[PDB]
Design a protein around this ligand. Structure first.
Ligand SMILES: Nc1nc2c(ncn2[C@@H]2O[C@@H]3COP(=O)(O)O[C@H]4[C@@H](O)[C@H](n5cnc6c(N)ncnc65)O[C@@H]4COP(=O)(O)O[C@H]3[C@H]2O)c(=O)[nH]1
Ligand SMILES: Nc1nc2c(ncn2[C@@H]2O[C@@H]3COP(=O)(O)O[C@H]4[C@@H](O)[C@H](n5cnc6c(N)ncnc65)O[C@@H]4COP(=O)(O)O[C@H]3[C@H]2O)c(=O)[nH]1
Ligand SMILES: Nc1nc2c(ncn2[C@@H]2O[C@@H]3COP(=O)(O)O[C@H]4[C@@H](O)[C@H](n5cnc6c(N)ncnc65)O[C@@H]4COP(=O)(O)O[C@H]3[C@H]2O)c(=O)[nH]1
Ligand SMILES: [Ca+2]
Ligand SMILES: [Ca+2]
Ligand SMILES: [Ca+2]
Ligand SMILES: [Ca+2]
Lengths: 87, 86, 87, 89, 86, 87
């Protein structure tokens, strides 16, 4: 960790909390992933059907959801690790 | 009964189950955020050398909760599939 | 609505406010959509031209704008609906 | 003032001006709806104080503040798309 | 002219200097993002084992670039101080 | 690093790149911080003045700016570190 600027040492309490966040994060993210795959297969069956547009939009929205979830976990983990804030 | 909300389409049992599964997992993570928040706040309240760090962590958990709610809203929207005019 | 966890019944007042917010959101959204179609048509004509990358960048930025707008509306609608906030 | 003084800025055109101002016109329209709802919740909270719905009103105010921020970001990105500044990265 | 844009206000020498200071520093970081992106891209283009990893980092650097431009826009907005109707 | 779920070991190339990102981030963040302090003092001199509202708004905007910058950095750093991505 010392090689990385602003990083501080781990502690047992921090490791547990960070892994608890990540575990719950992954649980939700895998739900997003399963829904994504479902939408993908449905879109793949007929790209010119009425619902194709709707399926494509749902894929984009689930990609947004995954991005937001990773940001939420990174902010939460940052709060726990309590890194040196220069600004 | 006719749909009262602009762009809303009807529910289906499959959509309800999926949306409630998203929200269930969302709240589970959100309650972890809430617990860490209360812990930090309590520390701050009883604080010392780390007061600044505690307040920054509180601000960052507030952001985390906001991002999580946005994650859930986008995913439930994707399942609901309301009319997307743009 | 009661089938969705955290949801509350609709009221005439909430329906009017929510609809008003969406109405305005769609208006702006349609402006974004028209500008998007313009750049798309420009790319159709331009192809390999000097401004192709600029049109593609504006397309990406309008996609971002659309995303932002939807998030604004969602947050506003949430404020009006007032669901149970568990965290 | 001169846009040329700002790094990456390019000259305006009638077309861009019209489009940019159309975005901002529609943006402010929605923002004023947010502001009206915000003021309504603010007054309700002023009146409510210790009442049971106080937490709901305060959360609604926080969420409308987020909504306003997102709308300005949406406008900014759309306007940037029309202006088409130099994009170094 | 700035007056043609709704809500815009006149520049000042101080504002110009601060806005360009933000944009300058923004670009330095952005170019670092761009260099890393091109490196990942060349790696993918000429490749294998970590293809998925390279593609993922390209997506994450695209996000990073977007966040940076938003950071700059907000900072620049703060300096310019346009009319804020809401 | 191996105690944190999803983390992979560091390498010298990674360390250098991540710290280069962080250095450039802080440089911009300190500019944001300097502007924030300037606006704060201006607001503190006359909180009932006509421009107090504008200064206050500028402070909120800078705060948002700082938050975006840290997110930019975290995403870039994540890209370089290349942790295990389960979803
Ligand atoms: N004080 C302190 N803070 C830390 C430490 N490790 C991370 N942090 C902070 O938490 C942020 C989020 O970590 P994350 O696990 O949720 O996302 C991390 C993680 O996904 C990835 N990352 C960090 N170290 C990694 C590593 N060894 N291996 C693989 N991936 C790694 O890059 C993300 C962003 O790193 P960052 O430095 O820019 O922001 C950290 C950083 O500010 C740490 O050891 N000490
Ligand atoms: N086709 C369809 N789409 C729906 C329906 N209900 C919601 N949606 C969509 O999913 C979005 C996210 O829902 P959320 O539950 O994750 O966050 C919702 C939810 O938290 C809250 N909300 C909506 N209806 C509510 C209600 N009755 N009661 C309490 N809160 C409510 O407001 C949020 C945003 O509403 P929104 O309309 O702008 O976007 C919806 C909306 O576009 C629906 O019934 N049918
Ligand atoms: N080629 C080009 N691109 C422009 C020009 N003006 C703006 N842009 C781009 O559009 C972005 C968003 O514009 P906005 O009106 O929606 O937000 C603006 C606006 O709210 C404020 N701003 C810009 N010029 C201003 C000005 N004279 N006076 C008051 N406020 C001003 O700051 C934001 C712009 O910050 P930015 O420079 O980082 O991003 C611009 C910038 O990238 C321009 O004249 N030429
Ligand atoms: Ca009162
Ligand atoms: Ca009063
Ligand atoms: Ca009283
Ligand atoms: Ca000054």
């Amino acid at each position: 960790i010392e090689d990385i600027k602003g990083y501080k040492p781990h502690t047992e309490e921090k490791i547990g909390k960070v892994n608890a966040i990540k575990d719950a994060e992954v649980r939700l993210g895998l739900i997003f992933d399963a829904l994504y795959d479902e939408f993908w297969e449905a879109l793949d069956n007929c790209e010119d059907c009425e619902f194709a547009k709707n399926y494509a939009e749902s894929l984009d929205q689930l990609t947004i959801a995954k991005t937001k979830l990773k940001e939420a976990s990174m902010w939460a983990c940052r709060a726990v690790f309590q890194p040196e804030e220069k600004y």
